[PDB]
C-alpha cells in the first residue's frame, strides 16, 4: 500500500476486510478498514472524525484515493467476543462485567447526546485493551453507508424487535436493546437470542419475553412485518433467564429489554441505576 504497510488481515468486517497496518510516515499501528464498493457517506463519516470519547474507537482518518475508501481507526488488541470465549470456563468476573457495561453506557450516552446511533452493536465490535477500557467500534457508520457491503452471514442476535418487525426507522433504543443482550451474554456465558433467521430471531425473543401485544407495546400490531398469526408465548421471569445476576442487574436488564423502544431505559438513566452503586474499573486478564 502506498501509505501503509500491512502487518496482517484482521478479518472480515461488516463493511469490508479489516487490516492491522503501520502508517509509513508515523510508524503507528492502526486498524485499516477497506469499504467494499458514494459522495454522501464521505462527508457524513468525516463528521465522525469529530465524535471523540474514551469509550469510542477513535476514527483517525477517512482516505478516499484511487476511487477506493478506507477508514483508519485506533487499533485495539482484542474484542469482547474473543474475550468471552477465552473467559468461558470461569466467566468474566462480575466486577469486570459491571465495569464493561458502565463504560459501554458512557459511550452510548455520549454518541446519543450527539444524535449518532450505532444500530449494529455486537460483541465483535466492542474492543478491549489491557488497561480495563472497552470501546465501541463503528458508531455512525450504519446511517452513513445504509445497505450491501458483504455476502458474509450477518448476525441477527442483537437486533431490536422493532427492526425485526420491519420498522424502517431507528432510535437510540435499538442500541440499548443490543447492549442488554450483550450484558445477558456476559453474565450467563451464552447468547441470549441466537437466531439464525429473522423469524427464528423474533420467535426466540417472543419465547423468552412473551409475544408482544398492544398493552405492552402500543402500535406493535400495525408494524410492517407483524402478523396476527404469530404464536402467543407467555413471558419468562428474568430470574430464570440470567441467574445468578442479582435483582439490581435483573431490574436494569428488564428496562433495557422492554419491547416498546420508547419505554427502554436511556443510556444516561442506566448509568444512574442502583446496579452501578459499587462499580469499579478492574484490570482484565488479557492473553495476546
Ligand X SMILES: O=C(O)Cc1ccc(OC2=CC=NC(=O)C2)cc1
Residue 201 annotated as binding?
no
Do 135 and 125 meet the contact criterion of CB atoms below 8 Å apart?
no
Do 217 and 173 meet the contact criterion of CB atoms below 8 Å apart?
no
Per-residue cell: 190 = 451464552
Quote the CA–CA distance of 266 and 108 in Å, as a whole number: 9
Choice between 97 and 141, CB closer to ligand X: 141
Annotation says 120 is catalytic: yes
Quote the CA–CA distance of 29 and 77 in Å, as a whole number: 11
Choice between 101 and 121, CB closer to ligand X: 121
From the list 11-19, 103-111, 211-219, 265-273, the region that binds ligand X by CB under 6 A is: 11-19
Dihedrals φ, ψ of 237, to 5°?
-70, 140
Write the binding mask 204 to 243 for ligand X: x where contact by CB under 6 A, - elsewhere.
Answer: ----------------------------------------
Quote the CA–CA distance of 131 and 24 in Å, as a whole number: 27
Based on the shown chain and the rule CB under 6 A, indicate whether residue 141 belongs to the binding site for ligand X.
no
Based on the shown chain and the rule CB under 6 A, indicate whether residue 48 belongs to the binding site for ligand X.
no
**From the list 56, 59, 70, 79, which residue makes contact with ligand X (rule: CB under 6 A)?**
79
Closest CB 12 distance from ligand X, rounded Å:
7
Per-residue cell: 282 = 478492574
Catalytic annotation, pick one of 120, 175, 237, 260? 120
**From the list 5, 11, 200, 219, which residue makes contact with ligand X (rule: CB under 6 A)?**
11
Of 94, 80, 82, 153, residue with least CA distance to 122: 80
Residue 122 annotated as binding?
yes
Write the binding mask 96 to 135 for ligand X: x where contact by CB under 6 A, - elsewhere.
Answer: ----------------------------xx-x--------
Quote the CA–CA distance of 34 and 264 in Å, as a whole number: 35
Look at the chain and count its residues. 288
Do 87 and 136 meet the contact criterion of CB atoms below 8 Å apart?
no
Per-residue cell: 199 = 423469524
What value does the CA radius of gyration of the chain take, rounded to a whole number of Å?
19
**Within positions 20 to 39, which residues make up the interface with ligand X, using CB under 6 A?**
31
Quote the CA–CA distance of 187 and 10 in Å, as a whole number: 27
Residue 17 annotated as binding?
yes
Count of chain residues binding ligand X (CB under 6 A)? 13
Residue 15 annotated as binding?
yes
Based on the shown chain and the rule CB under 6 A, indicate whether residue 76 belongs to the binding site for ligand X.
yes
Of 249, 212, 214, residue with least CA distance to 234: 212
Residue 26 annotated as binding?
no
Choice between 60 and 271, CB closer to ligand X: 60
Residues with a catalytic annotation lie at: 120
Binding site: what residues are annotated?
A: 10-18, 33, 74-76, 79, 122-125, 138
Binding footprint of ligand X on the chain (CB under 6 A): 10-11, 13-14, 18, 31, 75-76, 79, 124-125, 127, 137
Amino acid at each position: 500500500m502506498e501509505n501503509f504497510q500491512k502487518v496482517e488481515k484482521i478479518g472480515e468486517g461488516t463493511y469490508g476486510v479489516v487490516y492491522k497496518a503501520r502508517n509509513k510516515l508515523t510508524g503507528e499501528v492502526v486498524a485499516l478498514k477497506k469499504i467494499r464498493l458514494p459522495s454522501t457517506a464521505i462527508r457524513e463519516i468525516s463528521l465522525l472524525k469529530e465524535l471523540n470519547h474514551p469509550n469510542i474507537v477513535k476514527l483517525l482518518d477517512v482516505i478516499h484515493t484511487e476511487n477506493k475508501l478506507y477508514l483508519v481507526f485506533e487499533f485495539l488488541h482484542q474484542d469482547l467476543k474473543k474475550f468471552m470465549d477465552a473467559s468461558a470456563l470461569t466467566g468474566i468476573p462480575l466486577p469486570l462485567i459491571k465495569s464493561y457495561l458502565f463504560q459501554l453506557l458512557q459511550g452510548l450516552a455520549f454518541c446519543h447526546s450527539h444524535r449518532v446511533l450505532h444500530r449494529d452493536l455486537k460483541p465483535q465490535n466492542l474492543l478491549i485493551n489491557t488497561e480495563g477500557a472497552i470501546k465501541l467500534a463503528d458508531f455512525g457508520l450504519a446511517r452513513a453507508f445504509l445497505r450491501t457491503y458483504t455476502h458474509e452471514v450477518v448476525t441477527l442476535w442483537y437486533r431490536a424487535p422493532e427492526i425485526l418487525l420491519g420498522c424502517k426507522y431507528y432510535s437510540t433504543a435499538v442500541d440499548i436493546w443490543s447492549l442488554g443482550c450483550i450484558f445477558a451474554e456476559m453474565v450467563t456465558r451464552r447468547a441470549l437470542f441466537p437466531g439464525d433467521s429473522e423469524i427464528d430471531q423474533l420467535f426466540r425473543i417472543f419465547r423468552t419475553l412473551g409475544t408482544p401485544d398492544e398493552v405492552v407495546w402500543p402500535g406493535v400490531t400495525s408494524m410492517p412485518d407483524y402478523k396476527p398469526s404469530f404464536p402467543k408465548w407467555a413471558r419468562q421471569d428474568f430470574s430464570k433467564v440470567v441467574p445468578p445476576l442479582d435483582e439490581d442487574g435483573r431490574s436494569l436488564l428488564s428496562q433495557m429489554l422492554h419491547y416498546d423502544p420508547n419505554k427502554r431505559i436511556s443510556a444516561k438513566a442506566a448509568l444512574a441505576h442502583p446496579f452501578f452503586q459499587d462499580v469499579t474499573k478492574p484490570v482484565p486478564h488479557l492473553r495476546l
